[PDB]
Design a binder for this molecule. Structure first.
Ligand SMILES: [Ca+2]
Ligand SMILES: [Cl-]
Length: 496
């Protein structure tokens, strides 16, 4: 469960948040495969409640109605088509698995669901699975409200309703079987793994129990005995009874301290500075590199939704964001996930975005197609951070240097730092209020290298900055504090 199952030499996955299946299929072939992306994390493919007030929020997808593959992203055929097309070009699919709960206990019964299936939250009847009142933790929860009231109580965190969502009785073999059934349906179509939503709210053992019921990966695309990659969503900043280490037996875990700390450092808050990143990694109290899934931001926290808080860097902070994502992709710690978002009408009222619920770009609830502009960026309110030159080029950087050790670290004691990856890549950052202009040891073979942040290596030349490495691996670097992108990156494959 620890191996992502990506094609050799593909080191990252992209979250194509709320995208339609047909658009992901196209994206795999026209961009992901040619640009070296290892895989895609998709939004929950199972039927959810259609919430009309507010109007179709992104969060309605974390409120399952059934295990039917029918959502605003598309139907089963479309999902199967996408997995096929993606796998055939060597781009893997990771399904966001929503298995700790069903919908909010207070949603109205009926058929307001993405696939029209009937449901009755009130009576706990989910006839499309089916599930009944006997499959929930109602009798287990011991909180007054039936909801999680105390995060210092571990039992509570797992048997009570997270924000009122109907908590499934995961110790029951019937429940475990229904979920494994859904997951096995996905494995057979061709998925390579799963993001386990709200793992913190589930006992490690119950998760184990479900995993034991799973099939090996599709033998048409994976080697026999291949196990699905598992990464569990556990929010573990310090101090709670639940530790992320309690989930290592099941797979990797999301390292939420990563983006929270990186954000503080890049923003230069709390007396933090880039020179402190010399020992970034476990040295910072993070989980072992072999069990981490890292990222700058995720779908929840880029909304100010406190899974790292105010220090989280997002596409909204484009300059600092490219820097942070570049740092993450060059650094050997963990397995990296890149975020791809949609723009929404952010409207702050007393430090709160009143429109943090806004769903993907739509026309009366129908998700708008991902359009591609002449310059390769996207239209229709899709941000497509994965298509920003500085980001896609750093995805490539990570593939080129895979396996190379962290070396040739430099720092000015402030926010000007540089580091290499073996003899295959070198990166330099200027986050200080003055220019950087120094000759550094890069550990790279002599030559002219294209800077992949400002441009690209295209048919024997560079469209951006050219770096000259002398015979002794030294190269001069100049970076103005007012540069658009105050960082430079060169690698074995950007050399002319
Ligand atoms: Ca639970
Ligand atoms: Cl996540």
């Amino acid at each position: 469960q620890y191996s992502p199952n990506t094609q050799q030499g593909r080191t990252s996955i992209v979250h194509l948040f709320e995208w339609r299946w047909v658009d992901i299929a196209l994206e795999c072939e026209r961009y992901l495969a040619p640009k070296g992306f290892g895989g895609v994390q998709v939004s929950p493919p199972n039927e959810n409640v259609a919430i009309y007030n507010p109007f179709r929020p992104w969060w309605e997808r974390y409120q399952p109605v059934s295990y039917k593959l029918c959502t605003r992203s598309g139907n089963e055929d479309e999902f199967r088509n996408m997995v096929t097309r993606c796998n055939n070009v060597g781009v893997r699919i990771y399904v966001d698995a929503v298995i700790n709960h069903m919908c909010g206990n207070a949603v109205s019964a009926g058929t307001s669901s993405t696939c029209g299936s009937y449901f009755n939250p009130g009576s706990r009847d989910f006839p499309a699975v089916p599930y009944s009142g006997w499959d929930f933790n109602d009798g287990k929860c011991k909180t007054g409200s039936g909801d999680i009231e105390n995060y210092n109580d571990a039992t509570q965190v797992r048997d009570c309703r997270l924000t009122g969502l109907l908590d499934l009785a995961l110790e029951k073999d019937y429940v475990r079987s229904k979920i494994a059934e859904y997951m096995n349906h996905l494995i057979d179509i061709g998925v390579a793994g799963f993001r386990l939503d709200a793992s913190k709210h589930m006992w490690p053992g119950d998760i184990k129990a479900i995993l034991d019921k799973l099939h090996n990966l599709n033998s048409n695309w994976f080697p026999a005995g291949s196990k699905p990659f598992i990464y569990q969503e556990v929010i573990d900043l310090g101090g709670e009874p639940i530790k992320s280490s309690d989930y290592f037996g099941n797979g990797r875990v999301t390292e939420f301290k990563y983006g929270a700390k990186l954000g503080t450092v890049i923003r230069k808050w709390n007396g933090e500075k880039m020179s402190y990143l010399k020992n970034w990694g476990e040295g910072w109290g993070f989980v072992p590199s072999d069990r981490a899934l890292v990222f700058v931001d995720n779908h929840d926290n880029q909304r100010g939704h406190g899974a790292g808080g105010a220090s989280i860097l997002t596409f909204w902070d484009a300059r600092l964001y490219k820097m942070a994502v570049g740092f993450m992709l060059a650094h050997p710690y963990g397995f990296t996930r890149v975020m791809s978002s949609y723009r929404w009408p952010r409207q702050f009222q007393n430090g709160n975005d009143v429109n943090d619920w806004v769903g993907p770009p739509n026309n009366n609830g129908v998700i708008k197609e991902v359009t591609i502009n002449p310059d390769t960026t996207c239209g229709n309110d899709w941000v497509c951070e994965h298509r920003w030159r500085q980001i896609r080029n750093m995805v490539i950087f990570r593939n080129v240097v895979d396996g190379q050790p962290f070396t040739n670290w430099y720092d000015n004691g402030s926010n000007q730092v540089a580091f290499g990856r073996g003899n295959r890549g070198f990166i330099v950052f200027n986050n200080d209020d003055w220019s950087f202009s120094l000759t550094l040891q890069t550990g790279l073979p002599a030559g002219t290298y294209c800077d992949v942040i400002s441009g690209d290596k295209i048919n024997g030349n560079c469209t951006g900055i050219k770096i000259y490495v002398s015979d002794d691996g030294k190269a001069h670097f100049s970076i103005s504090n007012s540069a658009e992108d105050p960082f430079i990156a060169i690698h074995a494959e950007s050399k002319l």
